[PDB]
C-alpha positions in Angstrom: 104.0 97.6 112.0 105.2 97.8 107.9 104.6 100.3 105.2 103.5 98.0 102.4 105.2 98.6 99.2 102.8 98.3 95.9 105.0 97.4 93.2 103.4 99.3 90.6 103.5 102.7 90.9 105.4 102.8 93.9 103.0 103.4 95.8 101.9 102.2 99.5 99.0 101.0 101.1 97.0 103.6 102.0 93.8 103.3 104.8 92.7 106.5 104.8 89.8 107.7 107.8 86.2 107.9 105.9 86.7 104.0 105.0 88.5 104.6 101.5 91.6 103.7 100.9 94.4 104.1 97.8 98.1 104.6 97.3 100.5 107.0 98.0 103.7 108.0 97.0 104.4 109.7 101.0 106.0 107.6 103.1 105.5 109.6 105.8 101.7 109.4 105.7 100.9 108.2 109.6 98.3 106.9 107.9 100.7 104.0 105.9 101.8 102.3 108.5 99.5 99.0 108.2 100.6 96.2 110.8 99.7 92.6 109.4 98.3 90.0 111.9 97.5 86.5 110.6 95.0 84.7 112.0 96.0 81.1 111.1 98.7 80.0 108.3 98.3 81.8 105.7 95.6 84.4 106.9 96.6 87.9 106.4 94.6 90.1 108.7 95.9 94.2 107.7 95.1 97.5 110.3 95.7 100.3 110.6 97.8 101.3 112.9 96.7 105.1 113.4 92.7 103.4 113.2 92.6 100.6 113.6 90.6 99.9 110.3 90.5 96.9 108.6 91.8 96.2 105.4 88.6 94.6 103.9 87.4 93.1 100.0 83.8 94.2 98.8 81.7 92.1 96.7 82.7 94.1 93.8 86.1 93.8 95.3 86.7 97.1 96.6 89.0 97.6 98.9 87.7 99.0 101.9 88.0 100.0 105.7 86.4 98.4 108.0 85.6 99.9 111.7 86.0 96.0 112.6 87.1 93.1 111.3 84.9 90.3 109.8 84.3 87.9 106.8 85.7 90.8 104.2 89.1 91.7 106.5 90.4 88.2 105.5 94.1 87.9 103.7 95.4 85.5 101.3 99.0 85.8 101.0 101.0 83.9 98.8 105.1 85.0 99.4 105.3 84.8 95.1 108.8 84.9 93.9 110.3 88.2 93.3 110.3 87.6 96.7 106.4 89.9 96.5 103.6 89.0 98.4 100.3 88.9 97.4 97.0 89.0 99.2 94.3 87.0 98.0 90.7 87.5 99.2 90.2 84.7 101.0 85.8 85.2 100.5 87.0 85.4 96.8 89.5 83.2 96.6 87.8 81.2 94.4 87.5 84.1 91.5 91.0 85.1 92.3 90.6 88.7 93.6 93.4 90.1 95.2 94.4 93.6 97.2 96.8 95.8 94.6 97.0 99.4 93.6 97.2 101.3 90.2 99.3 102.9 88.4 97.4 105.9 89.8 97.5 105.2 93.2 93.7 103.7 93.1 92.6 100.7 94.3 92.0 98.1 91.8 88.6 96.5 92.1 89.5 92.9 92.7 87.6 91.3 89.7 90.1 93.3 88.1 92.6 92.1 89.0 95.1 88.8 87.7 98.0 86.1 88.8 100.5 87.8 86.9 99.8 91.9 86.7 102.5 94.7 87.9 99.3 95.7 89.9 99.5 92.6 93.1 102.9 92.9 94.2 103.8 94.2 97.4 106.4 94.1 98.6 106.3 95.4 103.4 108.8 97.3 104.1 109.8 98.3 107.8 107.3 101.2 109.5 
């Protein structure tokens, strides 16, 4: 189990129960305890320990919580240099659609993310 610390405004990825994912500067929230599992090497799954939903990304690139894992719940996982990670939506690895949060907490649409951005670096912390 592990908080997912986005380096941007310092939030913690939070998959909510209505499927809305966004970020929170609140550690205490239990909807932010995600656990990562790996479907293969370099490929990871991310799911709420609280609700069991899965992280996932539309075709619009909208991070969203899915009740059951699928083609959209899989994410590439690179261990950047700052020591920070980076999850590339697999289904949209071709267009570098990263999982990211903006400074205001909202998520970032896959398409507007871009390597080198600061909203795309998460630092997994223990739960």
